[PDB]
Amino acid sequence: SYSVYVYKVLKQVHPDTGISSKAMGIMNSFVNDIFERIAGEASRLAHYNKRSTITSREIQTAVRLLLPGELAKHAVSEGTKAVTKYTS
Amino acid sequence: SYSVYVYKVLKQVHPDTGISSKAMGIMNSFVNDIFERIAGEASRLAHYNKRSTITSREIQTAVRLLLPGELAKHAVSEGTKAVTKYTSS
Amino acid sequence: SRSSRAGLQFPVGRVHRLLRKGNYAERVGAGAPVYMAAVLEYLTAEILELAGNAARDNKKTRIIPRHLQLAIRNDEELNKLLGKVTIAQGG
Amino acid sequence: SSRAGLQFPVGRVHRLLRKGNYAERVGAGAPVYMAAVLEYLTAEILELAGNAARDNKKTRIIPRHLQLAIRNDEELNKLLGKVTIAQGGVL
Amino acid sequence: GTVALREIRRYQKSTELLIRKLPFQRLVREIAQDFKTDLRFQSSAVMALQEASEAYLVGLFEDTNLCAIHAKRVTIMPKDIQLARRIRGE
Amino acid sequence: GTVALREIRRYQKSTELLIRKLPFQRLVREIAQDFKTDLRFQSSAVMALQEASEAYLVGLFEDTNLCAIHAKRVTIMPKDIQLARRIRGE
Amino acid sequence: DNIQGITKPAIRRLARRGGVKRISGLIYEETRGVLKVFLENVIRDAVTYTEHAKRKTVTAMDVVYALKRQGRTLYGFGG
Amino acid sequence: DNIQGITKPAIRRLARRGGVKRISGLIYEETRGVLKVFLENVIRDAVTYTEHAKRKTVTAMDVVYALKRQGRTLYGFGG
DNA sequence: TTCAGGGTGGTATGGCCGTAGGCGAGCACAAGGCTGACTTTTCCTCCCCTTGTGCTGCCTTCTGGGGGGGGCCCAGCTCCTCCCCATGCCAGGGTC
DNA sequence: GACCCTGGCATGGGGAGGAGCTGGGCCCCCCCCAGAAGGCAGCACAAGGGGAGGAAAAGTCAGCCTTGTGCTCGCCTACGGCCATACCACCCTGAA
């Protein structure tokens, strides 16, 4: 489901390093796990606030609630850099 | 808040017994937790089987997943009886 | 209405409304509220029949959170079902 | 996702969010944000596991190396604490 | 000799709060001031925190007692607390 | 002593499967016949049940080793297994 | 420094409710840290909820959700 | 009795992977009993999923869901 | 080859300003029930010794798992029907 | 008392069904060799007993500070109203 996309990132941080076809079966179950977690949390934040829109804010608060200390600090910085580049 | 119906159920089973406001608040959180449990499970089943309608079968399977042993057996029998009587009325 | 027609005491209509507005599926059937209401009624009746016996054991009429905690942690199935639940002011 | 300097399918995560029944409406910043978060976690994982595989005189990432990075990184260890990595062993 | 047993019975037949509310509230507000300045609270948020913390410590102490009985002991220790916490995951 | 230490090292450095596949499949089928007669299994379903059960047992034995070390022991025992399971929750 | 607010008699009462028959002299200092980390986790989650709700007053529902996020459902403070 | 196929050498290998240095004589029976409460639960969840799906072949995805709903995720045997 | 993307109408969501009241911070004041310090003892934890019993290291047999090779037929997937279940929306009134 | 639950009506769409079609799960067969299993010698480590010392338990007493009550103030937050634009549904295109 995401096999292509991991290779793209792989070729950046490890240009010479390949990956097994059993390891990519994990990352396809890893992105499927984190995505469902964040989107399962950003969907409960909206229900608390009696809302119906999963905007960029409901994702960020879901990221901080799930990701540990320093994982949640650069994720909400790299992620924040994405929305200010795609919008403008 | 399910206070009225929990009160009615309590007077149905125990005719003379009463209940306090804190116990009522506890039961009205118990019900709102179990309802969300059996609804999240019936949504998981509906998404897994790629269907589009929560029905009696999804609730049945969710009950069998959630409630253990005799609780699930008795609850599933109760629900089957309820929906069987529902169509005649 | 549906509550009386299904031989129940719980709000079939309210359960259906909560299912529909709960975003549990794009569509919701016409038997799921009746099934859910009966399951919840059975669970509540079981707990209120156990807590009633527990409270009458102490010769007390009004049921307090401690009675509910005693019933839940005494009955095995309810104990494992609510095995991660903090019954506030229960003991 | 070239509009936001990413390598993930912003369109695909938008579609998954829309069909996931996670809300009545989905914003136009949630796809980009979640794609960027997914990309950061992916890059962190295949940097730690890449370093691990280099330390094992191998040029290919394998599940043993993936669980050699997740378990040897305390942030990722806490995050994936209830995860059974297939063909991973323990260390 | 019997004081420990009578205290166990007294505190296992009662459901009161065993941490004083004013110091618990001060501790909670001191902890919250490390996150957000001038953050208010409620008369039920602090009570929920107190009930949760007391139930968690009671469970932790029951498991610590199990760890102490394991090591042929009746005195709980930081070793027993650490073993209980490591096994249950924290 | 040295033999046990070398076995520990070898099986900690390795990632293969530790239970034999065909007897595991017979066990899985024996248990599943009670739930549903004349049931069938994808081979990957059994290959996933195995990689779940073996890691579960490895974790349980790690916790049991901690329990045995608690009582100042190197031998792991049924009582240690039960203590680890009680503290975990099962 | 308000961590001494969890005094020795309170920790002893919490232990004696847990069946503990004897308590070491270093249990109190360790239980203080245990309570501190538990409170810090739950309060950080509740403060995150409150900041999301663009509020300045934490609520019992904030605390209940912050506790549900780690497997500890609370019965009673939501009704 | 196909649980006996979970032989003593396999249990010893699992223990040695865990880090165990010496093993008692009843650990084998106790571990067999422990394994046949794990299988008897995950297989029951997977079979009820299969029966809901009107199928008669358990699937890797059925096993993965039965494992994830009891708080034990699996990475690799899906999709 | 179906999925990501450009342009457009519409509207339902959500943002801005008001505001008014509930309730949370905050200051006094005991007071008495609880915590803090001291003393005693006694009972428990830790160290040592011995042992005898159970676990382990090594041999050897044989047995049953693993690696193919092949069949087949049974069940899971696919495509088209269509018709019946559920939904969108307005109005009356029963209940919470 | 008010608001949403049901009744009623019109309607798109989803899933129950009927075939077909083929992938793979089950069954059988053959072999064979590495691992399981039964045994024995040996040892080293778990458990029982004993002694000591020190560190919690238990009682006493003085003090202190939580808290139960009172009252004040002002700030937060829920409700209202209005309106602005963001997102969705739809039609087509072209691309990975």
Numbering used by the authors:
A (entry chain H): 36 to 123
B (entry chain D): 36 to 124
C (entry chain C): 16 to 106
D (entry chain G): 18 to 108
E (entry chain E), F (entry chain A): 44 to 133
G (entry chain F), H (entry chain B): 24 to 102
What does the paper say about this structure?
pmcThe specific interaction of proteins with the nucleosome is central to the regulation of chromatin function and dynamics. The tardigrade damage suppressor (Dsup) and vertebrate high-mobility group N (HMGN) proteins bind specifically to nucleosomes via a conserved motif whose structure has not been experimentally determined. Here we used cryo-EM to show that both proteins bind to the nucleosome acidic patch via analogous arginine anchors with one molecule bound to each face of the nucleosome. In addition, to study nucleosome structure in the context of active chromatin, we analyzed nucleosomes that were reconstituted with a promoter-containing DNA sequence from a Xenopus borealis somatic 5S rDNA gene.
Unexpectedly, cross-linking of the 147 and 167 bp nucleosomes with either glutaraldehyde or formaldehyde resulted only in cryo-EM structures of unwrapped nucleosomes, which is in contrast to non-cross-linked samples that show both closed and open conformations. Furthermore, the cross-linked nucleosomes exhibit DNA that is flexible starting at SHLs ±5, indicating greater flexibility in the upstream DNA end in cross-linked nucleosomes. We did not detect closed, open I, or open II states in either the 147 bp or 167 bp cross-linked nucleosomes, which suggests that cross-linking affects the inherent dynamics of 5S rDNA nucleosomes. Moreover, the increased flexibility in the upstream DNA end in the cross-linked relative to the non-cross-linked nucleosomes correlates with a configuration of the side chain of H2A R77 that would collide with a fully wrapped DNA turn. In addition, the two H2A R77 residues in the glutaraldehyde cross-linked 167 bp nucleosome adopt different conformations that are consistent with the highly flexible DNA ends. These findings support a relationship between the conformation of H2A R77 and the flexibility of the nearby nucleosomal outer gyre. Importantly, glutaraldehyde causes only a minor increase in the histone Cα root-mean-square deviation (RMSD) values, suggesting that octamer interactions not involving lysines, such as those of histones H2A and H2B with the HMGN motif, are largely unaffected by the cross-linking.
